[PDB]
Design a protein around this nucleic acid. Structure first.
Length: 106
DNA sequence: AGTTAATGATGATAGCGGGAGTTATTCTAGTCGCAGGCGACCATTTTGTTTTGTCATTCAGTGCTATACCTGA
């Protein structure tokens, strides 16, 4: 029990939320937690910044949609959180060091 | 001289309703030559869709100060 069961709610919010980005103001409101409700969790249970963890989660979620043989490549990053194509391209290039088409063909 | 009764013919009408099935069957008639337009195939340029590079506006975490509930003197 950390801050009255915030771990059991963060995962549910991440799984049920839409492609809306997750920031301090967005998440803290109806999350049941303060900025400090989440800082201690991100420091202890995860030990990683939010901008990197959210990007990794989006990449792991899109790894299946890229294999689902979808022709609308521009909408894949949009349906999962990336509001722009260039941001998703840079994130994928810095993470996997591979072009988007090279991983989409696989 | 010119006017009323009378003759063969084309001209033309003769029912509202629904009921069905695959589609019926050919008149006999040649070939040889040159020349223009088009169906079809493919290459190329224009435009839409995709990936990549070069400049600023912003949000995490580290750490301290501030406030409230629990255990204690």
């Amino acid at each position: 029990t950390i801050s009255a069961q915030v771990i059991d709610t963060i995962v549910e919010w991440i799984d049920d939320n839409l492609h809306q980005p997750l920031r301090i103001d967005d998440i803290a409101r109806h999350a049941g937690y303060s900025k400090w409700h989440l800082q201690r969790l991100f420091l202890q249970y995860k030990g990683e910044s939010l901008g990197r963890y959210i990007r990794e989660r989006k990449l792991l979620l899109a790894a299946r949609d890229l294999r689902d043989t979808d022709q609308r490549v521009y909408d894949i990053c949009l349906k999962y959180g990336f509001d722009s194509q260039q941001t998703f391209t840079r994130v994928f290039t810095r993470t996997f060091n591979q072009p988007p088409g090279a991983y989409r063909k696989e």
